[PDB]
Design a protein. Structure first.
Ligand SMILES: [Zn+2]
Length: 326
């Protein structure tokens, strides 16, 4: 059937002024900060105590929500420059049997550095993306709970992926990066979806991969990377502009906007690559340039910008609701 092409024709159900006002009010940055972010600001490379703790924190936070989230741990072993290691992607899915999902993702591992005095906690990279996904889940819980109800809607729902092993152990290389994402995209490619089908895989079921990385620095600028997601990127610009106009964003100017008209010269390697090379459409919400503090001990909580993240939470939540027609 043509169901795998439905994503090509899929349209947002755009929210009005009062609904935008409701979403903006519904998200709490101080809450996210204390309850979702802070517990992740720890060293969490693969096999570390913090890796276990982060995965426990992600799972608990999702589990407390009303929405019908089904959690799985995609755990596997790989060789690495330090010897064999275990990796565990966290996948959180509403309506696992719906043929189509909008997929949001980031990586929850932090890059290994030897202590300076100091410890690398990857605040923007990617503790904040993780927290943004968890705040989204929380803020949107009641609207997401309606997806439990079956009927007059497309066969479409939401998935969250928190990848393990995004970072290289030593120098970045095709074999020493993307442990989690290379593994999972190969698993999904080889798995029938829906169950019992012929031809189609779980990759066909991915409407759009929205990959958050390196979020939390002030005045980020996001290029529109890919023509095949450019219409969805333009929605983020429209949502940004409108929230701005309605007075719903803080410390935000039009001249200082996040989402840009221009594209990007090179090719950024990230968790989306194994999906993108197999034809999954990608909306890659990583800034250019990268934050100043990138891969530095100063990628920490103090160098994060609260209003930026708050504003980005509002824009992402609106986008997700519009996509899902909620
Ligand atoms: Zn990094």
């Amino acid at each position: 059937s043509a169901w795998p092409e439905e994503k090509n024709y899929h349209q947002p159900a755009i929210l009005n002024s009062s609904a935008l006002r409701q979403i903006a009010e519904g998200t709490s940055i101080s809450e996210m900060w204390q309850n979702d972010l802070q517990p992740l600001l720890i060293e969490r490379y693969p096999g570390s105590p913090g890796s276990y703790a982060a995965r426990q924190h992600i799972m608990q936070r999702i589990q407390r929500l009303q929405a019908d989230w089904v959690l799985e741990i995609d755990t596997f072993l790989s060789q690495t420059p330090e010897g064999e290691r275990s990796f565990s992607n966290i996948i959180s899915t509403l309506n696992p049997t719906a043929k189509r999902h909008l997929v949001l993702a980031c990586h929850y591992d932090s890059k290994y550095f030897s202590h300076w005095n100091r410890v690398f906690v990857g605040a923007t990279d990617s503790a904040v993306p993780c927290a943004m996904m968890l705040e989204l889940a929380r803020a949107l819980d009641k609207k997401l709970l309606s997806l439990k109800t079956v009927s007059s809607k497309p066969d479409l729902s939401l998935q969250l992926i928190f990848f393990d092993g995004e970072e290289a152990f030593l120098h970045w290389s095709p074999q020493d990066s993307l442990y989690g994402s290379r593994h999972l995209a190969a698993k999904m490619a080889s798995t029938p979806h829906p169950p019992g089908a012929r031809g189609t895989s779980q990759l066909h079921g991915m409407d759009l991969l929205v990959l958050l990385d390196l979020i939390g620095a002030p005045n980020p600028t996001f290029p529109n990377f890919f023509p095949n997601s450019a219409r969805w990127f333009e929605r983020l610009q429209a949502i940004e502009h409108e929230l701005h106009e309605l007075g719903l964003l803080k410390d935000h100017s039009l001249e200082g906007r996040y989402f840009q008209n221009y594209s990007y010269g090179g090719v950024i390697q990230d968790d989306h690559i194994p999906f993108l090379r197999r034809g999954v459409p990608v909306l890659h919400l990583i800034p250019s340039p990268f934050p100043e503090v990138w891969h530095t001990m100063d990628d920490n909580e103090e160098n994060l910008d609260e209003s930026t993240i708050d504003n980005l939470n509002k824009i992402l939540q609106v986008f997700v609701l519009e996509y899902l027609h909620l």
